[PDB]
Amino acid sequence: MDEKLLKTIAESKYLVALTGAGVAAESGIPTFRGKDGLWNRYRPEELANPQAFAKDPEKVWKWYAWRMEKVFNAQPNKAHQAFAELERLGVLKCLITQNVDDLHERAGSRNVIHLHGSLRVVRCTSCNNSFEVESAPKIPPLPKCDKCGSLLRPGVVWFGEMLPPDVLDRAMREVERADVIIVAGTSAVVQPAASLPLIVKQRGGAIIEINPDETPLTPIADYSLRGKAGEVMDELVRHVRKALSLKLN
Ligand SMILES: Nc1ncnc2c1ncn2[C@@H]1O[C@H](COP(=O)(O)OP(=O)(O)OC[C@H]2O[C@H](O)[C@H](O)[C@@H]2O)[C@@H](O)[C@H]1O
Ligand SMILES: [Zn+2]
């Protein structure tokens, strides 16, 4: 929280952000890895992959319906609010997230890229029909497509599956032009998302990591703030807004 950091942010020409599950932790949603991580209690090999879904679609759907209810009922936290405000102020140009929740949107964020899909989306496993839901379905019965009758599935990206080309390309273009990137709440291990901040640094930009833990990205982060995203981002944005308000214009 030194002048240099605030300066880097306030004077940035094209700041972007990459967020992970840690940014939703303060909304009561557990992260995937770490202490109470979901992947530590639930096996990603049975809940986060096409093979498992085909084997037992009822089990996978029951789990996602539960997660959907949790997210739809959760509220955006101070971190979500801070990112939306940083965008309102004209500083944050684009927010790229690995999160499948819609908390960034519900906080007011407008230019959001969902690298790994969204829990609000449900799509067919056979035809191209897809749509959004207001609340979680009850399982059983298995959600079936009203177009061809085939099994529907959560509109999220599972392990081994390819991120939508257009989505990753858009994110790539964003980081290729960013001079500063805030990387908050992500463990920096899952690819290709984890490689996006490297693009910014390789091109000459700065990395600002926000995470209570150190990660594989920490060694190259210009700034690495050990704290919760809610507290850190709220303070950072308030300081940035103040700095901007002081400019003689
Ligand atoms: N309050 C907090 N504020 C900021 N960061 C936090 C907070 N609480 C926890 N974290 C950090 O959030 C990070 C979350 O790491 P992950 O659980 O691996 O979440 P993520 O990086 O988004 O996962 C990537 C991807 O893998 C998953 O399978 C899934 O598809 C996901 O999108 C951790 O490094 C953790 O320390
Ligand atoms: Zn269909």
Swiss-Prot record:
One of its GO terms (cellular component) is cytoplasm. The keyword Zinc-finger does not apply. Changing residue 216 to M: Change in substrate affinity. Changing residue 191 to Y: Change in substrate affinity. Substrate binds at residues 64, 67. The keyword Transmembrane does not apply. Residues 1-243 form the Deacetylase sirtuin-type domain. 2 residues (Tyr-64 and Arg-67) present in a large hydrophobic pocket are probably involved in substrate specificity. They are important for desuccinylation activity, but dispensable for deacetylation activity. This is NAD-dependent protein deacylase 1. It comes from Archaeoglobus fulgidus (strain ATCC 49558 / DSM 4304 / JCM 9628 / NBRC 100126 / VC-16). The gene is cobB1.
